[PDB]
Design a protein around this ligand. Structure first.
Ligand SMILES: [Cl-]
Ligand SMILES: [Cl-]
Ligand SMILES: [Cl-]
Ligand code: NA
Ligand code: NA
Ligand code: NA
Ligand code: NA
Lengths: 83, 86
């Protein structure tokens, strides 16, 4: 139960990291666009901040132009692929 | 950045949890006890009144209700598009 909760959270964060790597942008560029530090974005992408607001993930979905439900589904699929 | 859509979608996600609770017939007081929060706290979450709730909280509630969070979010997006066209 809690393992899946933590694991899915990590995969959602890593899905956002993949969204950035897919489009070839550095952390510093996306961070500037979002008015956050590069370190803040990096700690989100790598799953180190456990209590990030849903709002932040919705902002990032809007920034990348990907539906948040698709981010979540992608994370679930990748979590299963790695299993 | 579409701040209007970001904020509305957040509230549609929260209200989707109110809908998920109602579909299975549990009262607020029961869920508040199981999730170790006050009934008032749960009510403010379900009604979209607290804007900075952690994603973790929604993952916990999805597991509690036995509903996949991606379906919760998809339901919210679709209902917002139907109601508001965005
Ligand atoms: Cl009730
Ligand atoms: Cl009120
Ligand atoms: Cl809040
Ligand atoms: Na930080
Ligand atoms: Na979205
Ligand atoms: Na889907
Ligand atoms: Na409480």
């Amino acid at each position: 139960n809690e393992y899946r909760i933590q694991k899915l959270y990590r995969y959602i964060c890593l899905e956002f990291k993949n969204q950035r790597q897919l489009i070839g942008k550095r952390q510093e560029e996306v961070a500037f666009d979002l008015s956050v530090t590069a370190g803040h974005l990096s700690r989100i992408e790598n799953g180190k901040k456990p209590r990030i607001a849903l709002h932040t993930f919705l902002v990032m979905s809007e920034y990348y132009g990907v539906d948040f439900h698709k981010v979540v589904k992608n994370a679930e699929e990748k979590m299963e692929l790695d299993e």
